[PDB]
Each structure stands twice: as structure tokens, then as C-alpha cells.
């Protein structure tokens, strides 16, 4: 069990834990499943749905960064591929081997086909695949425009292709805290920090639970912040300090497969002499592609795409492709998010052109704060967390913390060996959990058999509190299955209303909640209504 | 024989009947394109104003460099080029250009480095690989600051972290052009120093030959040739403008670099050494051990002024000097130190830099050129691309000799066409000296002296011993003597500073020993040739003058 229960429990044992995680982001996620494997009491509050943060709102894979090898920035490499690894071997279900396309042009550079082939060898030697069955090989002209039909002919002079990896962010993040709970851990979402126990230090903190008005104080030995882009908000609840970051926003589009196919990832330049790249990604039926940087100002819980972004993107789109002929009207999907980056650093500083970009500073009151970084470097992050947290529990109260391996120790529903038709998605997609489903598959009205312990398992299993946390972060329904969402989106709501047996103005105020994101999604409000 | 007597026929030759190509300049790029020709069946006369060599063919780094730099922004193809002339080459004259792994430092103090420790080595790896280096005995590997300092106890220790240490070679550049011209001489191309081409001769608007004056008796002759090239280096738009009846644009603009020699005991190294200069200019300098001393250098400045003599200037001096003193702390050196020096120019294209030498259609920086005249020009390059840079001209050559007149040539493979004294095996280098040094020692020349000689001169060695079996002249052992006599009668010396300078490592590289040995070879080549006592006094002051230079006396003051 993992649901609203074992929710209510959590809060009524946090009533001095050793201690307390404020983010339920891949960051705090992290922190928890080593700490709790490791011994200490840990209490974690995640303000709103589990990865309904940042860490779902990524370009949603795991880039090598093979650009860096223009400024000979080899160091960058290898961390790069190397930790890249580990999290393979920790969640063989989730990050999967996904070739790339990078298509050369002489009328437009950074590569030539002479220089992309030594470029991928020295690639594939630093991530130790040189000789695997993904090693990487070039493409004529001619053989690259069969699979890429669309794909710009003035200037082509082939493409190379090498070693990349798809990963479901959000799944990332769910399978880590499932693993934390496992292991006894207080994880209870859809809890708000709003203030601090103190007489100059940080005793404890004050959540409030915001399913019911109610406010509780909490006790622990320590307590660190993990709010990603929230890093500075969350400081400041103590009422003298700075500022320490400057978020930028970048969003995402989606298309159905038939407006513009791609068998694979393609990288490509912008055209517009900016240095930006762009991806276009295939994902189901679907094909995503961005992303895009400006500075925000405004709401962090829900950032919004606009009509600049979208001209941006849809001139790329088109000049790398003549002949798709996109238009705002075309767009079924849509994201935005907001990168947590520390004065000084930029967007381009994730691919080219304690952990690079992150830091881990103790505030004056006592307050532990890890910032910045990126996903892809989450588990060495929280690595660098356990270490000034088990010297602080001695060298101040002198606790007896365990020692572990974040490298080694596999998540939920991925234990298996790492070189591992609706059963077989199922697989794929929770791996080993994909059994408990199984046993599972008492049918719904107006679903299916497959369909219903899918969404049964989300209330028993992944603390689906609200329907929009199923269809967007627990699944693919939403973002990249839009024209199969009007058969469905009735139904589960009901089955959830049964599961909860909510009330008729408790269900009345869900209904109204899909709504509103689903209509800034499908940028209805853009469109002068669809 | 190659002598003046060879010079005096080939000079008749050259006025009997019509060439079909004629050559102007005598450096590396015309002992190129005449060794290429001459194998290949076509008729072929060259002529040279200075000795062979004398111009920028022998004022260069001495060094055949890699170009590990270009790494840094990735350009690998140019690095792929590279290695890969360099083994082309060093097939062909086994018997010059010589393995000498290079030591890189590495430091945290200097402020924006090139390499670090960590990427020193995958830099090395791409390196080794590019040039199939990897997996044999000169593979790279690093060294840790108390390794370097066991090599060089001497070097800079506030922030050094370590080194690198890969293949790189030394290379004697005037000893690479004789022996070009030497094969060609034998494959019965006229080849003629000391003569200046002074002006063409035409029929309508066409080029169809050169007036030369013969610069050791003021006679001027006529030479007829159905093509003309040059090849004058630095000296390109000076010569293309012989034709008055049509002014021209300018390609060329030439750069001047200096190289300064100390005793090895003031700055012992005991290998090629590359580092900053800490000028923060964005510049490199090398120190470099030959013989028993060390030179270094270099520099880069604009230049105008007489192109046949340029000088060292003690603003060259004290940028050079600013460089040792910073890298080597204790050493201390200053202008009484140095004992011998050299300055040259750089024959680069209006918009080119000594910088792309080193990543500071026919091959990088130069150009095949046919002009409205007829005229054809072979422009800019790098000494390490000469024979590539012949090629690319034979091919067009060829082209033109069978259109324009119907003329077949055999057609050669000049990657394995070996030059003079290098006709043996080019991985057995060791085993073929050890060989030749016993011949040597069977002649009557001790150790040391049989295996120098065979290593210098590879297989020509066997007529140095042959002539020493033979008569010493006065005041100079036999085996200096069987030098002199070799160069005399087959390598065309004419002129005193020709054999110390350019044949041998006398001047440069063993000043300290050249008093002993100076009057008793001005006097073997007077008796040889039979100077008049005039003609001897001032051969004498030439050769002074040119001490005086190597010396910097008059910055000396
Ligand atoms: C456009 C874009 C592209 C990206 N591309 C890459 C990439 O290519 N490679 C890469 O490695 N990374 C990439 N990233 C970055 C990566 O997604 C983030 O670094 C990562 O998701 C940050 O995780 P986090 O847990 O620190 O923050 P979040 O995921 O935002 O989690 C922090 C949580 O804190 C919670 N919180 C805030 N205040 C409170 C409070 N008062 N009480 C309780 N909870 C609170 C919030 O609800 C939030 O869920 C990209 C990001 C963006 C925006
Ligand atoms: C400081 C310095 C550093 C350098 N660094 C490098 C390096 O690291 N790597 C590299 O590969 N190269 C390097 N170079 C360049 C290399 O030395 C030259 O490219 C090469 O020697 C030039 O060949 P060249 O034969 O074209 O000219 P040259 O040797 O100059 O010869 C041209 C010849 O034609 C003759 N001539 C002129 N006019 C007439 C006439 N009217 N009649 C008859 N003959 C005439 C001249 O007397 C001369 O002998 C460097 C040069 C310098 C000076």
C-alpha cells in the first residue's frame, strides 16, 4: 500500500525525526532514497503532486553532449557518459538506448563528415561502447533522406549517428520515492512548507496539509531544501538574506506523427544565428520537438507558452523542413518549465555552446540548501548531501549513520539484470511492477481490463490523489496520446470519485481542475479557442 | 662528380639546345619539383642565385612538428595531414629527420593553458591514434612534478603538475635540400648555383625563356625552355616582376623569426621542451638540445629591408631572453651568453601567419599559378610539404607539355622515390648505421667519427670512406679532410661558408671548435680551385662578415 492511507499515517508520525526533505523533485527524491537506505529517520514534503516541479517539465532525455569535443572540453565528457551509466544500471526500465541523427550541411557549422566520424570514436572510447552493437556509423546523403522524407536537400552532405538515451523524467522520479517508502520513509505529498520552528537556529518547520486547513509543526535534528527553481522562496521564510538564482524558461510543442515523422532523434541548428540547436523527437505516434530561453518573471507553479515562442520554434521546424508546412493549428501538446540556475550560469551550458553547476551551502541558522544542477545528475548529487549530513549528525549529536552505495542500490520496479501488445507496454514501461498489474487485471465503466488495474495500481500504489497526476506524470495519456484523451477522461475521473468517494462538489472541483490544464496545453486560449 | 666542373657543362648545356622545364630557386621547393621531373623523363634545368639551401630553406625551427595544438579546436583533419606527410617523408630520407619526443609541461599558475593533466592524455591518445603511433615504442604516457623535475631540475616548480611526453622529430633542413638535388643531379638534370635570373625572353606577349648572369664571371647567356617555374620562396613577386611590360599585384608578405645557441651547460636539456612564453601573447617557444648545445627561439615580426641578409635585432634578443629567464629561474642567461644565432623569412600569402604553422586543393597556405605570360608560380607551404607540393606541380606539368606539344612522360611514385643516401630499409635506421660504422672503422677513422658520419650522411658514407682510405690536408684530421673532399667534388661547395654552414654543424652548433679548424679549410679550397691571392683575401672577408653575424658582435658592441 501507497496511497491517501498510508499518507495519513506518515503525517501522524511526523507529530524529532533526524531529518526533513523540503521538495518532492528529483533532487529530494534522491536525498530520501539514500538517506532511508542508509538508516536515518527522514521526514519529506512535497508542496504539490510528486515531480509536478520541474522534473517533469525537461526535454525529457539523457544527451551525451558530444558537442563539447569542439572545444576539446573532454573532462565534461566523460563525467557526462559516466554517470550517465550508473543511472542505467539503477533503473534499467527507464532510460533507454535511443540512437541519434545528426545530419551535416556545407551551406550552413560544427561538424563535416570527416570530423563528425573521429568525433564519435572518441565518443564511444570515453563511454566505454566502442565495439558494442551501439557504436557509431555515418550516412550517405542518399540513405539519410529515406528515413527522413522532409529533411532540407539544398547543401546535404550525410549524418552521423551514435549512442543516445529517451527517459521519462516524471517515472524517474515516482520510482525513486516508491523505493524511498519501501525502505521507511514519512513521504507525504501535497504538503506545503509555510515557516520555520526556531533561538537563532532551525529546530523544526510548519506544514500545512493542504487537503484539510490544517497545520502542523515539525522536529528534526536537520533540515535541508530541495525546492529546485523554489530554492530562494523557500530561504526566504525566515524573515536578512540575498538572492541566489535566475530561472529562464523553455518550452516544448507536439504534433501528431503524420506532420512531420522522424524514426529518431534529430539535432540540428536553428538557422536563425543565435549558435542555438534544436531537437525533433519522436515519442508514440507522436513527434515533440523545442525548447527555447527567456528570462521569467511570474508564476513558478504554472508557467505559460505564448505566441513569441511559438513563431521562434515554428520557423525553425520549417526551414529544417520545407515541406511540412506547420502552423500553430497543427500543435495537439504542449509544456513549459523553469531551469534552476545560479547567477551566472545559462541554458547552453547543459550541452555545449560538488557537481557542475550545483552547489551545497549551510545557512547561518542552520538550514542545509542544495541548488542548481541538472537531472541527469541527481544521484551524484544527493551523494555530496549524505556526506556533510552524516558528519553532522556526529559532530553535533553524534548518531551512528550507515554507509551505502547510491551507485549500486536499484529503485522501484527496477531490480532486474541491466542488459534485460498491451502487456508488453505495460512491461516496458513499470518493468518488474508490471506484475503486480497483472494479478490485478474487476474492470471499470466505460475503460478497459488493461486500462483499470493501471489506474487502480496508480491509487494503491503510486499516491494518486488527484485524477491530472494519473494522465499527466503517472502516464502518457495527456502529453503524447491528446486524440485517445475524449474516450477516457469521463470514466477514470468517476473511477477515482469511487475510489475516494469524494462528494458531488469535491468531484465537481476535479472536473474543473482538468479543464484549466488541459485547455493551456492544447493552447486553446492561443488559438482564439482551438 | 657534382662540382664546378659539373656546373661549367651543365652551364654550355643550358645554351645548346631548348629545355623543356626550366626551374628558378634552389631551396626545398625547387629541389622538389626538380627531383619529380628529372624521374620522370623530363628535360630539366635549374638555377639558383645564392649556394643551394642559402635563402629560408635553412633558416627554419630544425624541428618537424606535429601540430598536437590543433587538437584544441578540434581541426583533426590537419593533424591527420600532418602525421602523415612526416611518415611519407621520413620513408624517403631515413637518413634525416630523426625520432626526439617532445616534453610538454603542465602548469596551474600560468593563467589559460593549453592542456591539463586530465586532458593532456586523451590529447595524446587522438594523437597517437590519428598517425598509428598507438601500440608502438614511442606511444605517449605522462609524468608527475617530481618526474620532471628528475629530467630537468631546473624548471620553473611553482605550479607544475606534471607532463606529457610524445613523438616529435629533429630535422636538418639544409641537409634535406642537398640531398634532393644531389638525386637529381644523377638522374641528369642541370641543376646551377650562383646564377641570378635577371630577365625573360618572349616572342609576342609569351614568356619562352630567361636571360641568367653568371654571378662568378658577369657573363650573361640565353636559356630556352618551353616551360618556366619559380619556386623563389619569399623572393615570388620580385621575380614575377622581371616582366616590366606588365606591372602586377603583390602576393606576398613575409615575416621575419630568430633562433638564438648556448652552451648546454647553461641550459641543459635533455630533450625537446615546449611551454608559454608567460607574455600572455597567446604564443609558444621551444628549447631545444643538438650537438652539445641548446637553441631556442621563436619570434615574429613584420619585416621590409634586404632579403638575402636579414639580421638579428636585440629587440628579437630580449623577447627570446624574457621567455628563458621565466621558464628556467636559476639559469640566468643574457646576451654575453649566446654564441651563434640565425634569422629568416617566412614566404606567407597576403593573409596567412607564422601562427598556422604549428595551430598557433594543392596543400595548406600555398598555391599553383599560371600567369598571363606563361609563367607558372609555386607559392607558399611549409618545408614539411615540399614533396606534396611537388606533386600537385607535376601533375600540372604533364598536363601541359603533352596538350601544348604532344610530349609523353613516365609517370612515378614520388611517396618511394628515395633521395640521396637514403636507399636502405627506413625502420632499420640503428642496424644500418651499426653496419656502415664498421666500414668506417676499416678505413682508418675512429669510432665516434664512423658512426657520426653514417648517421649524417647514411649511405653516402661509403665514399667519404672510400676518399679517406686514400692524403690529409694540412691541419685537419682524415676525417674532416674526407668531408671536405666529399663536399668539394659532390656537393657542389663553392665557397667557404657553404661547407661550414650548410654541409656540416660547424658555425651553429660547434662554434667553439671552428678557430682550430677555420684557416686550414679556407686554404684547401684556395689551393683547390686556384684563387688568385685577391680572390682568396676577399672570400676571406666574406666569410667573416658572416661570423661577425652569427656572433651578434655589434650588439655586443
Ligand atoms: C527547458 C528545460 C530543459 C532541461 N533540459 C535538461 C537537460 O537537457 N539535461 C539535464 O540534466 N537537465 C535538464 N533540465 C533541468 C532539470 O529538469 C532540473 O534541473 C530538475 O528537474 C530539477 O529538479 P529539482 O527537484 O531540483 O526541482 P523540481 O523538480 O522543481 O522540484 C522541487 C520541488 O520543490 C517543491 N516546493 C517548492 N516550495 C515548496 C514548499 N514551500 N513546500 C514544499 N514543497 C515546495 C515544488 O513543488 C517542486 O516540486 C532542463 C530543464 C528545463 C526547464
Ligand atoms: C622563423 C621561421 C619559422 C618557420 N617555421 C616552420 C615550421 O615550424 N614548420 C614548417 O613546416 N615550416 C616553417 N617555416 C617555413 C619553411 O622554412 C619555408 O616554407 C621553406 O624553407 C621555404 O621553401 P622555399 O624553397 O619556398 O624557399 P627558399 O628556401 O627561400 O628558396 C628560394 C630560392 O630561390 C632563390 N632566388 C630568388 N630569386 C632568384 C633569382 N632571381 N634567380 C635565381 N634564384 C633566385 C633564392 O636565393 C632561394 O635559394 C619557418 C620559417 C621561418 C623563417
Do not use: C
Not at 566520424?117 to 561502447?129: E, H, I, R, T
Not at 556526506?387 to 551512528?400: F, H, P, S
Request: proline letters at 5%; zero cysteines.
Amino acid at each position: 500500500m501507497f496511497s491517501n492511507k498510508t499518507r495519513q499515517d506518515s503525517i501522524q508520525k511526523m507529530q524529532e525525526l533526524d531529518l526533513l526533505i523540503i521538495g518532492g523533485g528529483i533532487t529530494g527524491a534522491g536525498v530520501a532514497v539514500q538517506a532511508a537506505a542508509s538508516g536515518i529517520k527522514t521526514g519529506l514534503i512535497e508542496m504539490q503532486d510528486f515531480a509536478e516541479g520541474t522534473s517533469s517539465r525537461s526535454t525529457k532525455l539523457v544527451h551525451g553532449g558530444i558537442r563539447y569535443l569542439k572545444t576539446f572540453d573532454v573532462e565534461v565528457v566523460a563525467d557526462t557518459v559516466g554517470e550517465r551509466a550508473v543511472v542505467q544500471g539503477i533503473a534499467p526500465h527507464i532510460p533507454k538506448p535511443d540512437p541519434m541523427l545528426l545530419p551535416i550541411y556545407e551551406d550552413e557549422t560544427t561538424f563535416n563528415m570527416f570530423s563528425v566520424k573521429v568525433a564519435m570514436d572518441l565518443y564511444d572510447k570515453l563511454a566505454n561502447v566502442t565495439g558494442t552493437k551501439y557504436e557509431n556509423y555515418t550516412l550517405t546523403p542518399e540513405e539519410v533522406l529515406e528515413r527522413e522524407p522532409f529533411l532540407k536537400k539544398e547543401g546535404l552532405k550525410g549524418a552521423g549517428v551514435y549512442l543516445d538515451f529517451r527517459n521519462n523524467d516524471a517515472r524517474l522520479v515516482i520510482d525513486n520515492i516508491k523505493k524511498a517508502a519501501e525502505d521507511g520513509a514519512y513521504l507525504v505529498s501535497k504538503m506545503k512548507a509555510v515557516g520555520f520552528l526556531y533561538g537563532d537556529q532551525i529546530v523544526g518547520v510548519k506544514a500545512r496539509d493542504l487537503l484539510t486547513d490544517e497545520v502542523i509543526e515539525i522536529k528534526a535534528k536537520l533540515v535541508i531544501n530541495t525546492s529546485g527553481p523554489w530554492v530562494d522562496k523557500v530561504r526566504n521564510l525566515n524573515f536578512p538574506v540575498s538572492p541566489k538564482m535566475r530561472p529562464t524558461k523553455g518550452i516544448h510543442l507536439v504534433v501528431d506523427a503524420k506532420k512531420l515523422p522522424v524514426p529518431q532523434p534529430t539535432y540540428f541548428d536553428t538557422g536563425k544565428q543565435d549558435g542555438r540547436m534544436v531537437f525533433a523527437i519522436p515519442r508514440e505516434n507522436k513527434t515533440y520537438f523545442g525548447t527555447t530561453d527567456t528570462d521569467y518573471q511570474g508564476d513558478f507553479t504554472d508557467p505559460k507558452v505564448t505566441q513569441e515562442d511559438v513563431d521562434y520554434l515554428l520557423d525553425v521546424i520549417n526551414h529544417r523542413y520545407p515541406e511540412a508546412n506547420i502552423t500553430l493549428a497543427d500543435i495537439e501538446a504542449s509544456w513549459a518549465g523553469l531551469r534552476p540556475l545560479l547567477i551566472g550560469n545559462s541554458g547552453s551550458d547543459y550541452n555545449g555552446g560538488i557537481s557542475r553547476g550545483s552547489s551545497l551551502e549551510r545557512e547561518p541558522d542552520g538550514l542545509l540548501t542544495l541548488s542548481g544542477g541538472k537531472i541527469t545528475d541527481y544521484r551524484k548529487m544527493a551523494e555530496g548531501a549524505l556526506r556533510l549530513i552524516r558528519q553532522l549528525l556526529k559532530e553535533e549529536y553524534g548518531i551512528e549513520t550507515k554507509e551505502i552505495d547510491s551507485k549500486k542500490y536499484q529503485i522501484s520496479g527496477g531490480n532486474f539484470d541491466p542488459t534485460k501488445e498491451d502487456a508488453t507496454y505495460i512491461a516496458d514501461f513499470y518493468g518488474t511492477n508490471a506484475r503486480r498489474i497483472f494479478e490485478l487485471a474487476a474492470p471499470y465503466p466505460g475503460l478497459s481490463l488493461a486500462e483499470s488495474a493501471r489506474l487502480r495500481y496508480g491509487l494503491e500504489e503510486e499516491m494518486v490523489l488527484a485524477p491530472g497526476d494519473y494522465l499527466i506524470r503517472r502516464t502518457n495519456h495527456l502529453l503524447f496520446e491528446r486524440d485517445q484523451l475524449d474516450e477516457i477522461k469521463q470514466p477514470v475521473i468517476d473511477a477515482i470519485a469511487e475510489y475516494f468517494g469524494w462528494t458531488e462538489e469535491e468531484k465537481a472541483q476535479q472536473t474543473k481542475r482538468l479543464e484549466a490544464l488541459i485547455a493551456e496545453s492544447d493552447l486553446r486560449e492561443l488559438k482564439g479557442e482551438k
